[PDB]
Amino acid sequence: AECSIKVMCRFRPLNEAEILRGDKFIPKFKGEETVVIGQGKPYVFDRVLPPNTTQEQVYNACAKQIVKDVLEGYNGTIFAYGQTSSGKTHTMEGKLHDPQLMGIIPRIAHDIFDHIYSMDENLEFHIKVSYFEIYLDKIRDPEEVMDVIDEGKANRHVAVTNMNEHSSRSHSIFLINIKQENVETEKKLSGKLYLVDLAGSEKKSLSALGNVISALAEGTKTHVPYRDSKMTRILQDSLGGNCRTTIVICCSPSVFNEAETKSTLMFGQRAKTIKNT
Amino acid sequence: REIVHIQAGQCGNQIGAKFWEVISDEHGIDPTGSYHGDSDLQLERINVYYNEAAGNKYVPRAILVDLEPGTMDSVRSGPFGQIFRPDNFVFGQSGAGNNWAKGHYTEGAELVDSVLDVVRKESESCDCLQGFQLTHSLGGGTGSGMGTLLISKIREEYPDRIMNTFSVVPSPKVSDTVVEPYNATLSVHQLVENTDETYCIDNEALYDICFRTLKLTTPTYGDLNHLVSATMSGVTTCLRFPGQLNADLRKLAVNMVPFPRLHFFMPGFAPLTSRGSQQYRALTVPELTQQMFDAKNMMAACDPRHGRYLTVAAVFRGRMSMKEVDEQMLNVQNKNSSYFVEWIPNNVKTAVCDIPPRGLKMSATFIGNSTAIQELFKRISEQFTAMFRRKAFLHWYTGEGMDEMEFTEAESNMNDLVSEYQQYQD
Amino acid sequence: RECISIHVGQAGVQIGNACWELYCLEHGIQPDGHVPRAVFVDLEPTVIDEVRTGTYRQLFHPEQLITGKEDAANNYARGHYTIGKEIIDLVLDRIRKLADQCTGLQGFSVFHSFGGGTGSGFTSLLMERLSVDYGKKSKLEFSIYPAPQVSTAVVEPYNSILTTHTTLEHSDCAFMVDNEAIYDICRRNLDIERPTYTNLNRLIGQIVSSITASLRFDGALNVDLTEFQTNLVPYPRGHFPLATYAPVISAEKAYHEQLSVAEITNACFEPANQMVKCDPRHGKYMACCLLYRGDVVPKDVNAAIATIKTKRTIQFVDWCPTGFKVGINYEPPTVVPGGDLAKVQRAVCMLSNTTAIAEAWARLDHKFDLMYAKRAFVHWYVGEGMEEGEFSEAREDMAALEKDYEEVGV
Ligand SMILES: Nc1nc2c(ncn2[C@@H]2O[C@H](COP(=O)(O)CP(=O)(O)OP(=O)(O)O)[C@@H](O)[C@H]2O)c(=O)[nH]1
Ligand SMILES: Nc1nc2c(ncn2[C@@H]2O[C@H](COP(=O)(O)OP(=O)(O)OP(=O)(O)O)[C@@H](O)[C@H]2O)c(=O)[nH]1
Ligand SMILES: [Mg+2]
Ligand SMILES: [Mg+2]
């Protein structure tokens, strides 16, 4: 079909300190797709979600259609890229009180099944999940799904970057493998649904992080067991070289971070086209 | 400064005898004697390989791991064999079966603790430890197994000190063993994930380089070994000497490994002329680079001319002009821009010691990282599958407490290792 | 009045032993006479030991000879931070103990070799700790910058983009001599395909002697260290001038030695004699600090320079008029009793920000990139003492040295 990688942009609200230290909401939204940072270049995305858009809202905007294609027999990825404490875990799984990539994980679980339940007796559905964490370091392995997500979250590393709640230390990846088979006709269908929550994008753990990004920039081994097989790898279909992919770059409105935010707004912008190989 | 060699298996062991045969003379250490050193410089840095106890007895700080007594009992019953403190001998009188699960899981695993014991007695010798030198062959029951274990343990005990590995990867044309790819694929696996500098020397690549680059008609093993040991001396020990521009393991690694795989090199010695006649002395320098950089003369099996280079390290050791050295390297980098990967104005880490190989005027060890070594692990990896598919001599492994998933593991791993290396050839 | 000098790094020490030799040689003070007025720093004992074993053995106080038996490491970080740190205090102590004993001094001297471990790193913080302890003086550092194509260390640039950025704000005026563009000097202006690193050192070891040594030494037109940075940097970027020497004639081959000023000064702007690539056309754009030494008549200069100011093909300076700081010393230059340096009775160690390097700088910068191209030889410094920072951030450094030497002219 030759479809491009969609990219939505979610800005979180000014946190304690920023709104304490004063700080001002630096971004300016125009139309439902462009954001501007001062007198600079107006970045246009498939969608831009200001702090205010609700999590349910953030869903319909990103994840919703992905869930529809994975069931039509397509593969779908969704990953939140961003500078720690910009909103990734908040949008990918998190609590309720902000914009899009809202509760991507839980919201997807319901949608997926609500769709299956409504289909005829034949065509049995076979969904099996995989919940895995942190590729840079040592990789560590509807209700039924939520019980697992709960189990998985528990085990995941906890990180912190800016007046946020539990701050990641790994690239947690949650895979949903939806299989389908029409019992009558016998014609099957399947599709993998990667829901990745990327680690901080910010610039000895920082030399380690620059070494990891550099190595991944030039491509990494193709192993399947050990070291090779990790970060910048899981949310791979969430950035480039991919399927029906959708990336949600998270950004801090505070000027205190103006820079990184500009670095992020650039990733999404570039990824937009995603000239996969 | 300090260093702790590891003689895994018979081969790795047999070679130990040659690596130490040499090195010692390159440090004036007689059997049990002390430092007879023709000079005074072959002593200020010895520590790297010995320990102070008596005052005339500087004992090599290596480990001798093997599940076949007879072997170490041939190395310990011959020439320099009586210099290693017995504590060094971590034997495994078990059946050193030619399986990649005997000298690593069943027989060697026992003798290990009695080795680590010493590898610690030597490490905690004195001053500051740098790393350990490891000699062995990836084509035998202990060695690729027991020696590959010795490191997996070493690298857990001091993930700080370095680990150079001198492996005698299974020569192509003819294999001096049968399961070879089994014992090999299994050891390379362990290597790509513990040691951080490996110098792979082929056996038949040696014969050639030893029967045509040394009109030598009867190249006994002792020889091959001897030639190899000649290179591993230029590498380590050497750089632990002064120099206008000296480097050290770290320098060779931080300047040779662009991507974490670990990557394997291919060592090449400089003056490699037949005895009498040839003693042409054409060693001004262009003659050494002439040498080192030709196809033949690469202890590896593959030929550089068959694939770019990522890094190169001419570790010279003999008084020369930082100009005629730094210069030559260049033309070399331009006459062959073709194969030398995108960074021309570079890819040639020049190193320069001062004192040369005892009896020679000028030499230069070559450590090449030519993505070319892809075409070797390929080889190995092939041989595996072609025989794994039928589980050929697999019962000798499993029957020794192994796993059908263990072999799978290694191949893949080492097989992926081939993949990656190509990621740069392009 | 008087100065001190701090020879840092094996090289800065070899050059030191040299510049220090020429000295007594033209002051009638044999092996054992008075007392020097400098210090020697290195994290590799064996080299300072050469000053403790070889010639000029007892002309020093084992107190002005600092060593760190430990490890040198051809990496700035390890030298500046980690290791080099431990010694600094002690180092300083002498340049505070030797700085006291005197009578109203004028400045420090740093003899260092840009692309080394003990030379780049260490000094970085030595000059660093000086700019604060004696901001009220001259800090003329005599450097031997990276040979344009004939570098040695694999990392060199990492170590030199880092010694420039850290020293820049402390004083620059760091002469910078690169054999690569100079070494050719040893093959084009001295003839020898046998140049040991011990030579390129004798050379910078010369150009540097012209900076501190003799300058901090009385003369007909003294030039303090401060003087440099003032008359030499148009802008805060720790601007990097280039070092050049004039009578680089061979003490064996040719012999026209008696080459009156009018000649030795013209021999500075020809690009094939500037210890930094070599190809900036005639001379080509700058502030230049023409330090002369030996028998020189101020008119000879205030004429030889006039002739130049009107060669145009040497296209100079911008907004400010006149960029020629004429520094005249008395005592002629010296030469290793028997190295390969001619031994004239007058020389010109001219060092500017533009000139041929100028090009030299760029031709040496480009080099760097090629290798760094993806961190390059970074793994050689990290394990020694350095990050992707120091490299990339010392590259950006010189970048504004390519713009600087461009703006102040053209
Ligand atoms: N260049 C050399 N290769 C050798 C030598 N001895 C053996 N080998 C090679 O090494 C492999 C066989 O190995 P070994 O003698 O080292 C086996 P090892 O004694 O480590 O273990 P065991 O299975 O317990 O006997 C094979 O490729 C032989 O062909 C040697 O002296 N020199
Ligand atoms: N003109 C000239 N240049 C030289 C000579 N020796 C070395 N060089 C230059 O200096 C560079 C070599 O520097 P190294 O000796 O590797 O490094 P260093 O400056 O000593 O500093 P370290 O890295 O701390 O050793 C080469 O690029 C040469 O261009 C010489 O005898 N004459
Ligand atoms: Mg054996
Ligand atoms: Mg040096």
Contact assignment for B344 to C381 by CB distance below 8 Å: no
In three-state secondary structure terms, B365 is strand
Number of H helices, E strands in chain A: 8, 10
Same domain? For C163 and C256 the reply is: no
Residues on chain C bordering chain B, Cβ-to-Cβ distance under 8 angstroms: 46, 74, 147, 149-155, 183, 186-187, 193-198, 200, 366-367, 370-371, 373-374, 376-384
Decide: C154 in ligand 2 pocket, CB within 6 A.
Answer: no
Nearest residue (by CA) to ligand 2, atom 32, is C200
CA of B263 to the centre of ligand 1 (A): 23
| Most informative mutation of C197, C207, C244 for ligand 2 (most atoms within 8 A of CB) | C197
Taking CA atoms, what residue in A is nearest to C379? A211
Number of domains forming the structure of chain C: 2
What is the CA C275 to chain-centroid distance, rounded? 10
DSSP assignment letter at C118: I
Closest CA to C149 of C375, C350, C368: C368
Output the six-digit token pair for C72.
Answer: 């040198």
Experimental technique of record: cryo-EM
Nearest C-alpha of chain A: how many angstroms from C77?
14
- φ/ψ of residue C79, rounded to 5: -75, -50
Q: For residue C379, give the nearest of B244, B255, B330 by CB distance.
A: B255
**A229: chain B residues, CB-CB within 8 Å:** none
Output the six-digit token pair for A231.
Answer: 């970060």
Closest CA to B43 of B54, B31, B32, B56: B56
**What's at C242, amino acid-wise?**
L
Q: For residue B172, what are the CA distances in angstroms to B206, B381, C125?
A: 12, 12, 55
Atom of ligand 2 nearest to the CA of C120: 24
Decide: C151 in ligand 2 pocket, CB within 6 A.
Answer: yes
**A230: chain B residues, CB-CB within 8 Å:** none
Host domain of residue C50? 6-242
DSSP assignment letter at C209: H
Nearest residue (by CA) to ligand 1, atom 18, is B10
Residues on chain A bordering chain B, Cβ-to-Cβ distance under 8 angstroms: 211, 215, 218-228
Residue C384 counted as domain residue? no
CA of B234 to the centre of ligand 3 (A): 27
Same domain? For C226 and C278 the reply is: no
Q: For residue B327, what are the CA distances in angstroms to B297, B323, B348, C195?
A: 22, 6, 11, 11
Residue C403 counted as domain residue? no
Q: What is the dihedral of CA B77, B78, B79, B81, to 10 degrees?
A: -30
Residue C363 counted as domain residue? no
Same domain? For C75 and C187 the reply is: yes
B339 and B392 Cβ atoms separated by less than 8 Å = no
Domain at C187, CATH number:
3.40.50.1440
The beta strand positions in B99-233, using DSSP E, are 129-136, 162-167, 197-199
Contact assignment for B254 to C384 by CB distance below 8 Å: yes
* Degrees, nearest 5: CA angle B293-B297-B300: 100
SS3 content of chain A, % helix, strand, coil (to 5): 30, 25, 45
Alpha helices in B8-64 (DSSP H): 11-25
Residue C81 counted as domain residue? yes
Contact assignment for B419 to A224 by CB distance below 8 Å: no
**CA C281 to CA A117: how far, in whole Å?**
81
C9 and C122 Cβ atoms separated by less than 8 Å = yes
Atom of ligand 1 nearest to the CA of B10: 19
Last residue of a domain, one of C220, C242, C264: C242
CA of C58 to the centre of ligand 2 (A): 28
Residues 6+ apart with CB under 8 A from B378: B418
Contact assignment for A207 to C375 by CB distance below 8 Å: no
Residue C361 counted as domain residue? no
Residue C134 counted as domain residue? yes
Q: Does C382 touch chain A (CB under 8 A)?
A: yes
Closest CA to B238 of A266, B120, B229, A21: B229
CA of C183 to the centre of ligand 2 (A): 8
Same domain? For C86 and C173 the reply is: yes
DSSP assignment letter at C49: H
**A220: chain B residues, CB-CB within 8 Å:** 420, 423
**HEC states along C53-103?**
HCCCCCCCCCCCEEECCCCCCCCHHHHHCHHHHHHHHHHHHHHHHHHHHCC
Contact assignment for B250 to C383 by CB distance below 8 Å: yes
Atom of ligand 2 nearest to the CA of C152: 16
Q: Which domains does chain B have, with CATH numbers?
A: 1-258 (3.40.50.1440), 259-372 (3.30.1330.20), 373-426 (1.10.287.600)
CA of B343 to the centre of ligand 2 (A): 22
Specify which residues A250 forms β-bridges with.
Answer: A10, A82
Domain at C272, CATH number:
3.30.1330.20
Same domain? For C145 and C203 the reply is: yes
Q: Which residues of C are catalytic?
A: 227
Q: For residue C379, give the nearest of B244, B253, B346 by CB distance.
A: B253
Q: For residue C377, give the nearest of B255, B321, B342 by CB distance.
A: B255
- φ/ψ of residue B319, rounded to 5: -45, 115
Residues 6+ apart with CB under 8 A from C187: B323, C193, C195
Residues on chain B bordering chain A, Cβ-to-Cβ distance under 8 angstroms: 193, 259-261, 409, 412-413, 416-417, 419-420, 423-424
Residues 6+ apart with CB under 8 A from A126: A178, A179, A180, A181
- The CATH code that applies to domain A6-273 is 3.40.850.10
Same domain? For C164 and C286 the reply is: no
CA torsion sign, C189 to C195 to C196 to C197?
positive
Contact assignment for A214 to C382 by CB distance below 8 Å: no
Residue C322 counted as domain residue? yes
- φ/ψ of residue B218, rounded to 5: -120, 70
Nearest C-alpha of chain B: how many angstroms from A227?
9
Alpha helices in C154-285 (DSSP H): 157-167, 179-188, 197-215, 225-232, 261-264, 266-269
Same domain? For C224 and C287 the reply is: no
List, as residue ranges, the binding site of B for GTP. Answer: 10, 68, 137, 141-143, 203, 225
**What's at C189, amino acid-wise?**
N
Taking CA atoms, what residue in A is nearest to C387? A207
